[PDB]
Design an enzyme around this catalytic site. Structure first.
Site, PDB file in Angstrom:
ATOM      1  CG  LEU I  43     -32.349 -24.961  11.162  1.00 32.13           C
ATOM      2  CD1 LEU I  43     -33.815 -25.257  11.436  1.00 32.13           C
ATOM      3  CD2 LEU I  43     -31.655 -24.450  12.415  1.00 32.13           C
ATOM      4  CG  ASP I  44     -27.341 -30.351  11.415  1.00 31.91           C
ATOM      5  OD1 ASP I  44     -28.482 -30.340  11.919  1.00 31.91           O
ATOM      6  OD2 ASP I  44     -26.381 -30.924  11.968  1.00 31.91           O
ATOM      7  CB  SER I  45     -29.178 -33.746   7.807  1.00 32.15           C
ATOM      8  OG  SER I  45     -29.100 -33.377   6.440  1.00 32.15           O
ATOM      9  CG  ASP I  47     -30.013 -28.458  13.648  1.00 30.45           C
ATOM     10  OD1 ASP I  47     -29.701 -29.159  14.636  1.00 30.45           O
ATOM     11  OD2 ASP I  47     -29.427 -27.395  13.354  1.00 30.45           O
ATOM     12  CB  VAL I  48     -33.998 -31.514   8.968  1.00 31.91           C
ATOM     13  CG1 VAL I  48     -35.279 -31.993   8.306  1.00 31.91           C
ATOM     14  CG2 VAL I  48     -33.516 -30.222   8.331  1.00 31.91           C
TER      15      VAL I  48
END
Ligand SMILES: CCCCCCCCCCCC(=O)SCCNC(=O)CCNC(=O)[C@H](O)C(C)(C)COP(=O)(O)O
Lengths: 82, 546, 85, 144, 117, 107, 108, 443, 88, 64, 125, 77
Positions: I43-45, I47-48
């Site tokens: 999960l990308d930034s 997503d985080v």
């Protein structure tokens, strides 16, 4: 506690928390409940307000549909001046 | 039965704050407060009935004089006229339900009994103010209700914002009180007595009306003095309800109506400006309490315009106060119930559905909203339409601006009130709290408020309601259509692209910021300059070393 | 005001004192005001019913007075020249 | 709610806080401090004397304001009829107007001159001639 | 433009906090969460059009322009949970910190509780 | 635990159990969630005092009432006050102490 | 935990008690050195005066200026009160011989 | 006179008490001050308001020392005799008892003096007493005593040539003959203005008080606050107006403007104070300026209003000093940032702080409110501009008052617990007196 | 109840897992206690950040920015919650 | 520090220099305050000025 | 739900400012200045220049109708004269300066009636 | 008088009001002191000065800069 319970993770919904007293949607259960005194008093107050408005309006509908100028000039022309 | 209207809440509050309260507890304190409120309410109802309907004014010698030095004579004397009877009846009817609600809202507060006692003190000092026959007792009531408001706002002494708000409101009211004191000095120096019945004026030196109106505007949170009102929401819901319904905010208008020694031009200008500012303020926020406070300010401006119109306008303004108090308190209490059902959430953007709260609270809020926005054949309907018609026939060309401004203000009133109800229930749910509290006492308080609202229609406040004034048919229907337009726009819940106007409106026009640095920081700098530069400097005398 | 002079007053000072009339209502319809006040301030709740005739009479008299005031204004404007004659 | 009702039994026995911080010891009655009796005696004596002064001294002895009320009531009574007769005699009113004009007074100070017949400057000017002689006559016929 | 502390954040962290605060503001300008959903999707998509950017000058240009846009759009009335910093329910009634008690102080050292001189 | 604690009452059932409030403070009003044992008897005695003071102020109020003008009609103040002047209606006809029209013009 | 009293009163000083005796100094605060320095500086702020540009400008425009304003206002109020009582010019300190203290025996 | 001499000798017996029997030492020291309170009560019961403007006249031959009683002197004596026992209740040394006994004797003797030379001699006989009091070795400040003593001596030295000049001019020093002789009003007027503008805190020469009243202990603080400033007001009323009216008139604009600027600058300066004691110190300046303007107004009832305000301050301000002293002694510091959460810590004490703060702020149900109303009535009748200036800045004092009160009282609980029985008893007379004079001062 | 203002480990873990699976890229079987966001869940930034905001909503928390920056795995978030007395 | 990870640490520092206001701005705002809050003084003084102007015109015309 | 844990305010550890008597520290974090907006950031990051610029036009925009109606239109705009009263009744009602009956341009002494209606401030001797 | 008259006060208690105002004026202005300006409760000096100024301006043939003098300002004078 909370009137809404959240299940999460697709957990099996508790059997004690199912029935006509529990209604679930999206895995989340809410309760069908009724309060006697609250509903009765609400109905009483709402009926009182509604009847108040209706009767006050019916006593004063002509003074609204036509103008006070129109109604009173109509009365003067039709039902005398003195 | 007469002195029961004043002394009884005072005695109840004294008992509630006495060491006797140690031996009673919160249960007993609630019992005592409710009983005192009910007894004073019964006495006030009897006095209202007798005075209003059979025209019997009674004057009371209470404690002899207060102080009589020189030609100045001040006496603890109480007189009950139609004005005093109306004020007492309204205040007692409001505060009884306020106490009923407070007995349940703060049930999990630690120091509930102190809150009850301060509420009782507030009500008793309001009764003292309205019971005044002379100006000194009016001042005493003014400062007593001010002190009670200070204590009540700073109830939660652990939050700095509430303390700041209380101090700011106290200082603003003290400015107004200095103006009022100067006016009282002028009134006594040019009239020789203090009893209102001995005050009949035809043309004063102007400063009388100017200073008195400024002092009244201070309490009524009018233009240049309204900033404190929004910050008062830091206090508990009952305090805000009681303050905004029948006390404190009403006192300035009550004094103006009792006096009728104002100047029409300034009164009308101030009232119209304040009403317009309150109207544009109420539709531009997202805190539930602040909107209702700004609505209170707008209705205060309406009353100001009405009393500026004339004697008949003054009586209509008094009736507007009498009808406004009930549903103002009702709106505050319904908002508090909804907030408590929302886990203390005081923001609109996390509401929705019909699951968070009880049916009665929703219906009460609906009725109060309908009455406040002038829905046809309702409590606020009659008073607002009477004031509008009397303002559509004024002999002042100045008033023509005021009429248009008040039309716009009423339309905006309907707008933000419908938006309030829409965000409360009509929209989808967007928060995380559902604890619908269905306790008997607050529901009964709402019932009492609604019954009083019904009475205000089924029985008129004065003879003005039903007195037909001759306007074109479109003119009478105009506020009805304006309310309909507000209904439509709010039910659309639409907004504009001109975001700079939005950021200006939301900021409350930056008035707090303006007063933060035009008078205040310069006061601080003047203080430092005086002390350091003069005393330790110019006025300093140093030591002769040897 | 000469073209439309006020009608004679049917209410005396003593009658208005007895009725305890507010002094700014001591108009050319004082008796109707007095009767309306006496009716409404005694009826209790059902005042709009058992006092309808009194209210209608008072409003009719006020309608006459308002017409007189409008006519006086029109005549004054015509004399001064504000309205074509 | 304890017991599930608003009408349930209480829950608190003992001492709720310590007044002044005075704490009982072994059931012995609290020692009186050294200064308490003398303080109480002196201050209560002063208060008793104050109440007795305010509620037992003669009204004239207590304050002058009582001494002057009966003496001024009669003067007001006898000057009310003087004022009323001045409302009935235009000649006397205009004579008083002329006197007031003589005495740096305005037309509206007519009743002011009537009420001041017992004032220091009035009688002294009467004796020294600054006051017109006719003022004495005005007072005399108005009293009549 | 951001604050000096945010200026010190790593490029990844700077952009992350930018996007987070932008979502916060969109909630703050939102009529409802339901209105906020499509705005959230569009805001996520707009960053997706900048995923494959390499030239640090244009990256810095976009970041600075977005920071200026966000700074121009600081909401006057933020939506806060009641019991957090800035919330209305914060700092209402805390637990009493421990305070020592002095019993029967007048009883101690009587006749000698005045002032030295 | 100190000696004087045994004389002290515990935290009330109303009080949140997770709260500590330095129970040793003597408060003018009672303190925190105060709820004594014999509280209902205290409440009844307090109401008795309230009623006695109510009667005293009721007597004083009826004593010091001054009515400068006749009322417009029947009032309940008659039943406990005789100093109340006999009412006079809007038309000036004097009315009896029952507030009804006297003979000659009544019925 | 000490015993500064006997079971029958009789305050014991407890000079030789191991426990720390509760006393008048029991609730004394622990002073913060920065706070102490600040309070000394503010109580001894007199050493910070200087005839700079700002201090002189402020002193003349505000202190002396408002002194003059209040003085002139007092003179105006006094003269207006004299004129509102029918009195001629009165001799203030250094105003040439003139009328002072209008006689109680004269009507003005 | 005989009774007074009996009290004078009876008070001196304190030194003759051996120090072994401390209990009797405290009893005797307290009772010696108790007695004059009852004596003044007996005097008030003996006074006649239907009698002469002066009563109980006595003269000690050709030794000057003319003693007579008006309402102002009697009321001031009553207030002082109420104050002094509380001060005695706060001392622990025989030296303090002797100093305060001599101070009380001097104050009482001056309060009913009728000889200007007598007032000159008797008033400043306590200057060395104040010098020893303020600059005590362990806790006092020598600089404050130096300041106040130099200011008082400067005033007295300025006055003395005027006093002797008018003595030679009229051949005597009695007021009732000084008031009846023609004199060079100007020089004596300057002398009186200088002395009573030093004594009462008036700008610019007022700077001794903020250091003095703070460096002194609680008893001396209350004494200085509630007594020696009122020696200035009674000084005006008893001497300056009865003797030299023309100077009073020609200086009226100067006195008024000086009082106004004093009030304004003191009010503005107070907000920047960082210590409670200094805040209380600046508070009295505005009250004294208001008293002085009320006296100088002479419009309708100036003397009575001034007396009412003097009594009100001498009642309320000592309560502020009592609270300050309790907090300092049971805290060992007076610095504001160490005061917080006092209401939960000191419920009754904080309530008293609130009540007496309101008392300082002229609120109804308090004697200060009626006092300022009467003073503003007197000021207004002279002119409305001065009354407006007093009225406009009412907010500015309450500003610092409420700010300091809320800052020290609300917030995080830290510091001492509530007050003791002795402290509540010391507070008690001021509360009861203020309530009594704010409900029914007259009858 | 339980906890000095704190909830149990287990319901926190269950809630975190239930929140975690709301991604199209995520296969359910690979979510587990103390799981890497980037390395494991992919999960990308953005997503985080979204997950941080979503957990803030779920537990009703206003996480400080630095602590949110410290959040980079499932276990870290769970333990952070296990430190919160303000989580519902 | 036990609550920093819940309600923020003391890392961020207030950006205030504690300095006296701008001289010209302070002067202008002081004058603005004086004018707004001492208007009766100016009203009375202007009334006196108008009154003396009336007297001056009367004196000028009455002696010719 | 009282008793929520609250962060405290740690005591300072560096030399204080000369004019530190403007920061309100109640012992709990977060503190505040003496008054809001006095220094530091403002919500929305607006500045005093912004609001001064906006008001410089907003005030005149609001005030303009007042002046225009008070300086270009008179009582003739209303199509009726005020409420009429008999001479012995009207003669007292119009004595009030605030009384609106003065605007009857049909009054027999209309200009004289308006002449008496002007407002003074200093009482004349 | 006021409480007995009620509404009719504007034509019934004029003379007693005049008497009371005259008494107040006598109490204040007589022995008013050295510094107190004169007091007119009934604005009598104001309106008399107004009438004199009106007459003087009429002789001056210029527009009045002051309000026309009033017949009475209070319920008394
Ligand atoms: C009301 C709205 C106001 C305006 C709000 C702002 C709207 C403007 C937004 C448009 C500007 C941008 O997107 S800002 C540009 C952001 N993109 C880049 O800088 C190029 C990629 N560089 C990288 O380092 C990483 O891939 C990165 C993706 C950053 C991190 O993702 P991860 O760590 O997972 O790896």
């Amino acid at each position: 506690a909370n009137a809404y319970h959240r299940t999460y993770n697709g957990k099996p919904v508790p059997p004690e928390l199912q029935g006509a007293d529990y209604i679930t949607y999206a895995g989340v259960t809410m309760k069908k409940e009724f309060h006697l005194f609250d509903t009765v008093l609400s109905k009483l107050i709402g009926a009182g307000a509604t009847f108040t408005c209706l009767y006050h309006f019916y006593l004063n509908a002509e003074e609204h549909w036509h103008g006070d100028i129109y109604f009173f000039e109509k009365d003067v022309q039709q039902n005398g001046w003195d | 039965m007469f002195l029961l209207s004043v002394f009884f809440p005072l005695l109840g509050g004294l008992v509630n704050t006495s060491p006797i309260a140690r031996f009673l507890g919160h249960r007993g304190s609630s019992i005592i407060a409710i009983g005192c409120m009910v007894v004073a309410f019964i006495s006030s109802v009897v006095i209202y009935y007798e005075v209003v309907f059979m025209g019997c004014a009674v004057s009371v010698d209470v404690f002899g004089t207060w102080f009589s030095v020189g030609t100045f004579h001040a006496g603890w004397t109480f007189n009950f006229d139609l004005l005093t009877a109306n004020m007492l009846f309204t205040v007692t009817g409001v505060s009884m339900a306020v106490h009923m609600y407070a007995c349940d809202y703060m049930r999990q507060d630690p120091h509930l009994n102190l809150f009850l006692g301060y509420l009782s003190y507030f009500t008793g000092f309001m009764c003292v103010l309205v019971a005044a026959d002379n100006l000194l007792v009016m001042l005493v009531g003014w400062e007593g209700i001010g002190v009670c408001s200070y204590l009540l706002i700073g109830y939660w002494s652990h939050r700095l914002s509430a303390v700041k708000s209380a101090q700011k409101a106290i200082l603003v009211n003290r400015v107004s009180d200095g103006l009022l004191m100067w006016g009282v000095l002028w009134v006594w120096y040019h009239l020789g007595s203090l009893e209102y019945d001995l005050l009949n004026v035809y043309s004063a030196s102007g400063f009388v009306g100017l200073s008195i109106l400024i002092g009244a505007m201070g309490k009524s949170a009018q233009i240049l003095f309204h900033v404190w009102l929004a910050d008062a929401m830091e206090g508990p819901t009952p305090v805000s309800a009681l303050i905004h319904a029948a006390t404190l905010v009403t006192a300035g208008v009550y004094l103006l109506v009792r006096l009728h020694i104002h100047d029409e031009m300034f009164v009308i200008i101030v009232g119209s400006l304040t009403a317009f500012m309150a109207g544009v303020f109420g539709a531009t926020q997202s805190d539930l309490k602040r909107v209702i406070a700004y609505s209170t300010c707008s209705q205060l401006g309406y009353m100001m315009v009405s009393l500026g119109l004339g004697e008949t306008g003054g009586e209509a303004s008094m009736g507007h106060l009498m009808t406004h108090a009930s549903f103002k308190a009702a709106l505050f209490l319904a908002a508090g119930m909804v907030i408590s059902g929302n886990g203390g959430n005081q923001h609109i953007a996390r509401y929705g559905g019909s699951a968070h709260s009880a049916m009665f609270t929703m219906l009460t809020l609906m009725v109060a909203s309908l009455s406040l926005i002038g829905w046809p054949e309702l409590s606020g309907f009659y008073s607002k339409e009477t004031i509008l018609n009397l303002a559509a026939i004024c002999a002042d060309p100045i008033a023509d601006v005021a009429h248009t401004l008040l039309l716009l203000t009423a339309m905006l009133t309907s707008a933000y009130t419908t938006k309030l109800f829409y965000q409360c229930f009509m929209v989808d749910f967007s928060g995380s709290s559902v604890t619908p509290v269905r306790n008997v006492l607050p529901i009964l308080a709402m019932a009492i408020l609604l019954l009083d609202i019904m009475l205000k229609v089924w029985v008129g406040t004065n003879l003005l309601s039903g007195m037909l004034f001759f306007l074109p048919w479109g003119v009478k229907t105009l506020p009805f259509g304006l309310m309909v337009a507000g209904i439509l726009t709010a039910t659309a819940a639409v907004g504009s692209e001109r975001f700079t106007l939005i950021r200006f409106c939301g900021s409350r026009w930056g008035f707090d910021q303006l007063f933060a640095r035009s008078p205040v920081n310069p006061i601080f700098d003047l203080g430092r300059i005086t002390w350091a530069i003069g005393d330790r400097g110019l006025l300093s005398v140093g030591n002769l070393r040897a | 005001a000469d073209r439309f002079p006020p009608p004679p007053m049917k209410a005396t000072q003593e009658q208005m004192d007895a009725a305890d009339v507010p002094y700014h209502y001591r108009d050319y319809c004082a008796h109707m005001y007095i009767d309306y006040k006496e009716c409404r301030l005694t009826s209790g709740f059902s005042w709009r019913t058992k006092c309808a005739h009194e209210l209608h009479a008072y409003n009719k008299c006020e309608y006459k007075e308002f017409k007189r005031r409008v006519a006086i204004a029109i005549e004054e404007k015509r004399r001064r020249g504000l309205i074509a004659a | 709610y304890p017991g599930g009702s608003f009408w349930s039994e209480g829950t608190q026995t003992g001492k709720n806080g310590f007044l002044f911080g005075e704490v009982p010891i072994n059931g012995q009655p609290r020692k009186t401090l050294w200064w308490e009796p003398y303080w109480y005696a002196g201050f209560g004596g002063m208060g008793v004397g104050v109440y007795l002064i305010y509620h037992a001294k003669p009204l004239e002895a207590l304050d002058i304001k009582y001494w002057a009320a009966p003496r001024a009531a009669k003067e007001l009574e006898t000057e009310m009829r003087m004022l009323d007769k001045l409302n009935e005699r235009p000649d006397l009113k205009e004579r008083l107007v002329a006197v007031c004009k003589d005495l740096n007074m305005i037309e509206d100070e007519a009743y002011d001159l009537v009420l001041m017949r017992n004032e220091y400057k009035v009688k002294l000017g009467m004796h020294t001639g600054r006051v017109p002689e006719d003022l004495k006559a005005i007072y005399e016929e108005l009293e009549a | 433009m951001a604050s000096e502390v945010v200026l010190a954040l790593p490029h990844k962290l700077r952009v992350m906090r930018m996007y987070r605060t932008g979502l916060k503001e969109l909630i703050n300008w939102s009529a409802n969460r339901h209105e906020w959903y499509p705005r959230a999707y569009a805001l996520r998509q707009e960053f997706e059009d900048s995923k494959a950017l390499t030239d640090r000058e244009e990256i810095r240009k976009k970041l600075e322009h977005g920071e200026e846009l966000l700074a121009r759009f600081r909401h006057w009335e933020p939506l806060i949970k009641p019991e957090f910093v800035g919330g209305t329910a914060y700092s209402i009634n805390p637990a009493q910190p421990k305070l020592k008690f002095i019993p029967n102080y007048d009883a101690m050292d009587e006749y000698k509780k005045g002032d030295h001189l | 635990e100190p000696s004087w604690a045994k004389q002290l009452a515990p935290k009330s059932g109303l009080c949140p159990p997770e709260f500590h409030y330095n129970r040793e403070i003597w408060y003018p009003h009672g303190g925190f969630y105060c709820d004594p044992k014999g509280w209902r008897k205290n409440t009844l005695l307090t109401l008795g005092g309230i009623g006695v003071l109510l009667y005293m102020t009721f007597s004083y109020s009826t004593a010091n009432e001054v009515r400068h003008m006749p009322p417009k009609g029947w009032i309940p103040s008659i039943m406990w006050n005789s100093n109340v002047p006999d009412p006079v209606d809007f038309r000036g006809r004097k009315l009896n102490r029952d507030g009804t029209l006297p003979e000659g013009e009544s019925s | 935990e000490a015993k500064q009293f006997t079971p029958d009163g009789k305050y014991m000083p407890g000079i030789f008690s191991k426990a720390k005796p509760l006393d008048r100094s029991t609730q004394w605060v622990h002073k913060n050195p920065y706070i102490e320095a600040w309070y000394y500086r503010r109580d001894h702020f007199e050493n910070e005066f200087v005839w700079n540009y700002r201090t002189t400008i402020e002193a003349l425009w505000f202190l002396g200026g408002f002194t003059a304003a209040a003085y002139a206002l007092s003179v105006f109020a006094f003269r207006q009160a004299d004129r509102r009582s029918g009195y001629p010019k009165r001799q203030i300190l250094g105003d040439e011989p003139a009328m002072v203290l209008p006689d109680e025996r004269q009507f003005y | 006179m005989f009774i007074s001499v009996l009290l004078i000798l009876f008070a001196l017996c304190v030194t003759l008490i051996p120090e072994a029997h401390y209990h009797m030492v405290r009893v005797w020291s307290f009772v010696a001050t108790i007695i004059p309170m009852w004596v003044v009560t007996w005097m008030w019961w003996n006074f006649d308001a239907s009698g002469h403007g002066l009563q109980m006249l006595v003269i000690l031959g050709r030794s000057h020392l003319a003693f007579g009683i008006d309402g102002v002197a009697l009321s001031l004596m009553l207030l002082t005799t109420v104050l002094f026992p509380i001060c005695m209740m706060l001392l622990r040394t025989v030296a303090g008892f002797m100093t305060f006994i001599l101070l009380e004797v001097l104050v009482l003797s001056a309060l009913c003096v009728l000889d200007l030379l007598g007032f000159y001699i008797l008033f400043e006989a306590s200057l060395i007493l104040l010098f020893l009091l303020i600059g005590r070795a362990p806790y006092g400040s020598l600089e404050a005593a130096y300041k106040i003593v130099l200011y008082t001596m400067a005033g007295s030295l300025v006055l003395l040539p005027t006093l002797f000049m008018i003595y030679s001019e009229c051949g005597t020093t009695n007021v009732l003959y000084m008031t009846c002789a023609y004199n060079h009003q100007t020089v004596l007027g300057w002398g009186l203005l200088a002395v009573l503008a030093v004594k009462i805190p008036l700008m610019p020469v007022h700077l001794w008080l903020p250091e003095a009243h703070v460096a002194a202990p609680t008893a001396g603080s209350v004494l200085l606050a509630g007594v020696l400033l009122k020696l200035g007001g009674i000084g005006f009323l008893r001497f300056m107006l009865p003797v030299v009216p023309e100077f009073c008139v020609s200086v009226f604009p100067l006195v008024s403007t000086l009082c106004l600027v004093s009030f304004l600058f003191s009010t503005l300066s107070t907000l920047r104070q960082i210590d409670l004691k200094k805040i209380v110190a600046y508070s009295s300046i505005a009250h004294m300026s208001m008293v002085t303007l009320a006296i100088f107004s002479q419009s309708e009832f100036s003397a009575y209003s001034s007396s009412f305000l003097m009594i009100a301050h001498g009642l309320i301000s000592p309560a502020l000093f009592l609270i300050v002293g309790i907090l300092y002694d049971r805290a060992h510091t007076k610095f504001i940032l160490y005061f917080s959460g006092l209401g939960a810590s000191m419920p009754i004490g904080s309530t008293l702080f609130f009540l007496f703060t309101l008392g300082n702020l002229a609120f109804p149900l308090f004697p200060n409110f009626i006092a300022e109303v009467l003073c503003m009535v007197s000021i207004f009748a002279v002119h409305e501009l001065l009354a407006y200036v007093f009225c406009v800045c009412q907010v500015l004092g309450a500003a610092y008052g409420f700010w300091a009160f809320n800052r020290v009282v609300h917030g995080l609980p830290r510091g001492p617990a509530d007050v003791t029985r002795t402290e509540f008893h010391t507070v008690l007379p001021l509360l009861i007196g203020a309530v009594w004079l704010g409900i029914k001062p007259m009858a | 109840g339980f906890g000095g203002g704190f909830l149990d480990k287990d319901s926190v873990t269950e809630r975190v897992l239930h929140v975690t699976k709301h991604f199209e890229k995520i296969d359910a079987s690979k979510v587990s206690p103390a799981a890497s966001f980037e390395k494991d869940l992919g999960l990308d930034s953005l997503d985080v950040v979204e997950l941080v905001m979503a957990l803030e909503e779920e537990f009703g928390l206003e996480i400080p920015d630095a602590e949110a920056d410290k959040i980079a795995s499932v276990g870290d978030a769970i333990n952070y919650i296990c430190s919160n007395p303000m989580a519902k | 520090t036990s609550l920093d990870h819940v309600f923020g640490d003391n890392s961020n520092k207030l950006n205030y220099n504690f300095e006296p206001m701008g001289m010209g701005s302070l002067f202008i705002r002081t004058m603005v305050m004086v004018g707004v809050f001492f208007f009766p003084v100016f009203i009375m003084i202007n009334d006196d000025y108008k009154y003396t102007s009336f007297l001056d015109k009367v004196a000028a015309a009455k002696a010719a | 739900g009282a008793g929520a844990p609250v962060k405290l305010a740690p005591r300072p550890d560096k030399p204080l400012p000369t004019w530190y008597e403007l920061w309100w520290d109640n012992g709990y974090y977060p503190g505040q200045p003496a008054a809001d907006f006095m220094f530091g950031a403002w919500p929305g990051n607006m500045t005093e220049t912004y609001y001064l610029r906006f008001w410089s036009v907003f005030g005149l925009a609001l005030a303009a109708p007042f002046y225009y109606v008070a300086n270009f239109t008179d009582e003739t705009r209303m199509p009726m004269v005020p409420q009429q009263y008999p001479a012995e009744v009207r003669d007292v009602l119009v004595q009030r300066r605030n009384s609106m009956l003065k605007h009857d341009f049909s009054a027999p002494d209309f200009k004289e009636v308006k002449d008496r209606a002007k407002i003074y401030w200093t009482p004349m001797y | 008088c006021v409480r007995a008259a009620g509404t009719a006060r504007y034509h019934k208690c004029t003379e007693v009001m005049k008497r009371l105002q005259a008494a107040v004026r006598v109490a204040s202005n007589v022995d008013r002191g050295p510094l107190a300006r004169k007091r007119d409760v009934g604005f009598i000096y104001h309106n008399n000065r107004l009438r004199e100024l009106q007459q003087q301006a009429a002789e001056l043939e210029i527009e009045n800069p002051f309000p026309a003098p009033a017949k009475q300002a209070t319920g008394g004078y």
